[PDB]
Write a protein that binds this ligand. Sequence first.
Ligand SMILES: [Fe+2]
Ligand SMILES: [Fe+2]
Ligand SMILES: [Fe+2]
Ligand SMILES: [Fe+2]
Lengths: 170, 170
Amino acid sequence: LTYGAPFNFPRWIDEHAHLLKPPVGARQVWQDSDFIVTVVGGPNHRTDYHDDPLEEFFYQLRGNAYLNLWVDGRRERADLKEGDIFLLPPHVRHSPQRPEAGSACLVIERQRPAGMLDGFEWYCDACGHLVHRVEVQLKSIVTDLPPLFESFYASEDKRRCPHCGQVHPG
Amino acid sequence: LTYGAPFNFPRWIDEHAHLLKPPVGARQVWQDSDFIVTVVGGPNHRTDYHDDPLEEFFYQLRGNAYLNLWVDGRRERADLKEGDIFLLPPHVRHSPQRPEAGSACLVIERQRPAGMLDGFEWYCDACGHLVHRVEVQLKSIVTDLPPLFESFYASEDKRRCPHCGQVHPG
Ligand SMILES: [Fe+2]
Ligand SMILES: [Fe+2]
Ligand SMILES: [Fe+2]
Ligand SMILES: [Fe+2]
């Protein structure tokens, strides 16, 4: 059993509560597995939209959250109330918002094969145009992703909408 | 949203309770998705071991179950007590036993690509030798799998251990 024996999930989440809040916010359950199994806590709000080339499964175990989406060219919202499950199709742009402390969401993804890239995008609050997109071969979320977000927040040029000129807040 | 909006999982399981028992026993949540998301009920005991070429994730939401395994050449058992999660590595032979009525287990698998075959195996209760193995391109569990099991149960020749000659009970 490469990934160990079964174990009690609510107790695991309790024992990792200190990591399910800022600044960490999430915790992957097993390492080096094909299924990426993560528990995401809160609070955490964010402005980036994720373009995942594969599906994402959600089961909101504790508390409530919601996903800001782009669907059919329009901004939409999918609520993840406590007890909700949800399967997100590939490439649907989503921005998870997790307002509640003590919340916990099971999120399951697949490891991306080489050449299958993730995208992270920001959109203009004023005119809705795409402001900035980075594509990334996502291997370790811990090292591959934070610098991406920091480099966007640090640069007015990256944050500048090419259509209406308004600078994204970061 | 190809797969619909989020929805309350405990209520979904309640509304499908009549299918989480014999003769059906399980119910896939979404169709035509890359992630195969199934709720498995009970009671159900079985004698076949599954050789899945990809991982299997378990979260035992209601009631208790256990997996009979082969691990390092020996017969073992992994208990899925209520609240347990578990990630099974590829190819570990497993035979789920679900003794309890009203139990419900979330099981998540991946659709197998072409050329990646599942195996289903039976082992001799007397000498532990492999009795029969069928490999299958698993596309629809509903049509691809029941005839496999029936053809094994119907044939003393398939059930006959090639090492000690004892006929498997089916
Ligand atoms: Fe995502
Ligand atoms: Fe703009
Ligand atoms: Fe299996
Ligand atoms: Fe035998």
